Amino acid sequence: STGSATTTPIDSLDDAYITPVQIGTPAQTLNLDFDTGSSDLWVFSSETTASEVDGQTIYTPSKSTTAKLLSGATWSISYGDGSSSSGDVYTDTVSVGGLTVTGQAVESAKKVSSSFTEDSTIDGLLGLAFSTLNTVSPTQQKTFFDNAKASLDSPVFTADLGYHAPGTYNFGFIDTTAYTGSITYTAVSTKQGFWEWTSTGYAVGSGTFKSTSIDGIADTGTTLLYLPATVVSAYWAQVSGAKSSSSVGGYVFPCSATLPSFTFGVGSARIVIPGDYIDFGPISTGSSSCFGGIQSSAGIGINIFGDVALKAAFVVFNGATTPTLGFASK
C-alpha cells in the first residue's frame, strides 16, 4: 500500500504546514501538523475545554462508529517551544492520502496551551518520530507510520515541503520525479527517539564549504534552522546590518538586505538553502527589521534541521530495520 497527501503552509511565512487527515467513521477530516520531531497523534476534540477551543475543527469520537476508548489511558506532552497539551486516548481508523491504519491511537485533548488555542489553522499534530517518544501512559502507543510500516510497499515516507507553496507527504514509495539528481542517504541514530543524523558541514553564500560534523534532527514540526552559534554567527556576519537581538530573541537584519544562501552537507552531497528562504519577515507589523530563519541552537540542547532546511530538499525518512535519511535537491 501507499498514501500521498498534500501539505499546505498555514500562513505566508511557512510557519508550519497542515495536512488533511481522515479520522473515524464516517470520516472526520482534521488538518494536522505532521511532526517528525514528536510521536503523538493528538487532536482538538469534543472533550477539549471549551474555553481553549477557538476556530479549530474538532474530533467527536461519539460520532465515530469505529472509535474505541483506551481504558484508563492518558497523555501529556511538552514541546520545545514551551507549548503543551494533554488528555485521554481513543483508537480509531485514520487515513492519510489514501493510506488507512485501523486501530490508530488518536489522543484526544482535554487541555491545550494558549499557543494552540490561538492558532486556528492547526487541528492537532501527527507525530512521525520514533514511537519510543510517545507519551501515552500506562502503555506507549505507536505512530501512524509505525502502524502502517509493514503494509507499505516500502517502509519509508518522504517530506517534500514547499517554499511559500504546497508540498507533499508520501508513504510507501519514492517519487523519482520529485527531485533533481540523486538522493544521498546518511545514517540515523534512534537513541534519543529522533531522526538524528550528522551533517558533514556548511557553506555561507558562495564561500568554500567548511567540513565539520554537525549532529542534528530532521524536524518538520520546527519552523526554522537551529545550528551551533559558531555556524550561525558565520552566516549573519555576511549580512549587512544583521545583529543578534536578545530583546527580539534572535538574529534580525534590515528587511531590504540581500541574504546569502546557506549550504549544508549530506555525505559528499550538498543542499543549498536559497537566501529568500531565510527571510521570515518583519519582527512586528510595519517594522523594517526582519527576523532570520537561521538561529542559534545554544540553549535548545540539540541542533534542528527544521522547515527552513527541509523545504530546500526532497527528504526520505527510511524506516527500515536500520533507519536512514535521504536528501536530494529539487
CATH number, domain of 121, equals 2.40.70.10
Same domain, 206 and 268: yes
Collapse the DSSP code of 146 into the 3-class scheme (helix H, G, I; strand E, B; otherwise coil) and give the result: helix
Whether the CB-CB separation of 117 and 145 falls below 8 Å is answered with no
> Which amino acid is present at 299?
G
Cell of 89: 486516548
d(CA 92, CA 155): 22
Nearest Cα to Cα of residue 74 among 60, 62, 90, 50? 90
Whether the CB-CB separation of 171 and 152 falls below 8 Å is answered with yes
Longest dimension (CA), the chain: 60
d(CA 187, CA 34): 22
C-alpha neighbours within 13 Å on the C-beta side of residue 257: 26
Nearest Cα to Cα of residue 317 among 186, 156, 144, 199? 156
Q: Which of 14, 33, 35, 160 is catalytic?
A: 35
Collapse the DSSP code of 292 into the 3-class scheme (helix H, G, I; strand E, B; otherwise coil) and give the result: strand
Same domain, 152 and 200: no
Whether the CB-CB separation of 17 and 7 falls below 8 Å is answered with yes
Same domain, 23 and 170: yes
Where in the sequence is the domain holding 153, given as residue range(s)? 5-174
Cell of 26: 464516517
Same domain, 84 and 103: yes
d(CA 212, CA 112): 40
Same domain, 160 and 194: no
Burial 287-321 (b: 16+ CB within 10 A, else e): eebbbbbbbbbeeeeebbbbbbbbbbbbbbbbbee
Q: Is 275 exposed, middle or buried (0-12, 13-18, 19+ CB in 10 A)?
A: middle
Collapse the DSSP code of 50 into the 3-class scheme (helix H, G, I; strand E, B; otherwise coil) and give the result: helix
Q: Where are the beta strands (DSSP E) in 10-123?
A: 17-23, 28-35, 41-43, 68-78, 84-96, 99-112
Whether the CB-CB separation of 147 and 141 falls below 8 Å is answered with no
Collapse the DSSP code of 278 into the 3-class scheme (helix H, G, I; strand E, B; otherwise coil) and give the result: helix
C-alpha neighbours within 13 Å on the C-beta side of residue 283: 17
Whether the CB-CB separation of 326 and 287 falls below 8 Å is answered with no
Structure solved via:
X-ray
d(CA 56, CA 45): 9
Distances (CA, A) of 142 to 5, 34, 86, 104, 253: 21, 15, 17, 8, 43
Nearest Cα to Cα of residue 66 among 28, 110, 120? 28
Nearest Cα to Cα of residue 234 among 207, 255, 252? 207
> Which amino acid is present at 114?
S
Task: Show which of 174, 197, 214 is a domain's final residue.
Answer: 174
Nearest Cα to Cα of residue 61 among 18, 26, 95, 31? 26
Same domain, 288 and 188: yes
Strand partners, 296: 227
d(CA 85, CA 74): 11
Whether the CB-CB separation of 309 and 264 falls below 8 Å is answered with yes
d(CA 130, CA 157): 13
d(CA 226, CA 267): 20
Domains identified in the chain, total number? 2
d(CA 319, CA 49): 36
Same domain, 25 and 124: yes
Give the distance, in angstroms, between the CA of residue 70 and the centroid of all CA atoms in the same chain: 27
Q: How many residues does the chain have?
A: 330
What phi and psi values does residue 197 have, to the nearest 5 degrees?
A: -145, 175
Collapse the DSSP code of 225 into the 3-class scheme (helix H, G, I; strand E, B; otherwise coil) and give the result: strand
Look-up of cell digits 511557512: 14
Output DSSP code: residue 219: -
Same domain, 82 and 140: yes
d(CA 164, CA 224): 14
Same domain, 82 and 188: no
Same domain, 189 and 314: yes
Distances (CA, A) of 87 to 70, 118, 263: 12, 19, 41
Same domain, 259 and 110: no
Q: Which of 108, 199, 261, 297 is catalytic?
A: 199
Contacts of residue 71, Cβ cutoff 8 Å, sequence gap at least 6: none
d(CA 272, CA 313): 8
> Which amino acid is present at 59?
Y
d(CA 51, CA 287): 33
The reply to whether 35 belongs to the active site is yes
d(CA 288, CA 202): 29
Look-up of cell digits 552531497: 269
Same domain, 150 and 208: no
Q: What angle do CA 121, 295, 258 make, to 5 degrees?
A: 95
Q: What angle do CA 164, 119, 61 make, to 5 degrees?
A: 115
Q: Is 183 exposed, middle or buried (0-12, 13-18, 19+ CB in 10 A)?
A: buried
Look-up of cell digits 511565512: 13
Task: Show which of 152, 174, 196 is a domain's final residue.
Answer: 174
Task: Show which of 147, 174, 201 is a domain's final residue.
Answer: 174
| Backbone dihedral region for residue 124 (phi beyond 0: left; psi -120 to 50: alpha; all else: beta) | left
Helices (H), 80-170: 114-118, 144-148
Nearest Cα to Cα of residue 21 among 145, 155, 173, 146? 145
d(CA 51, CA 42): 18
